[PDB]
Amino acid sequence: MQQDDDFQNFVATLESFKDLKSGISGSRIKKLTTYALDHIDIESKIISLIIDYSRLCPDSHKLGSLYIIDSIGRAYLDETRSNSNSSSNKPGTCAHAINTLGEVIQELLSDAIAKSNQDHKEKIRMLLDIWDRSGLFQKSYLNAIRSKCFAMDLEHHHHHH
């Protein structure tokens, strides 16, 4: 950790991501994840970055950022979980990280799904299901997506179950 693989690598990966034309390469996501975990002393900047990147641009970033946060979230959760997930306010470590995200996931998801279309919207929906199943954000479906009205509203002209 001698000034090697600092925020540069992280930010660099994300930046290059958006620079793409709706490609979303898993490689990038990996770098961000491994990096975050490798450096739990920067959960703030990290989580904050991905978060902003999402709400930043429309569906485009929405979907992309979503995937990124997903990977980091899972890993982070397991990490802190291994010891004890506890927090109150402001960033500090994995714990605070997950908490912060869950406090913004509302606008993030909602926006993503909305700005997203049948295709994109579909990806988000699936991801959400896996999240609950796995046990990432054990908040009993936050008000955010909680209100099915979210999908129903954004749900363009199309049949469904």
Binding site: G23, S25, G26, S71, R74, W131
Partner: peptide, 12 residues
């Protein structure tokens, strides 16, 4: 595009 595209959350 050969770059391990399509990142699924169900698979790390």
């Amino acid at each position: 595009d050969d770059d391990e595209d399509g990142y699924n959350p169900y698979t790390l």
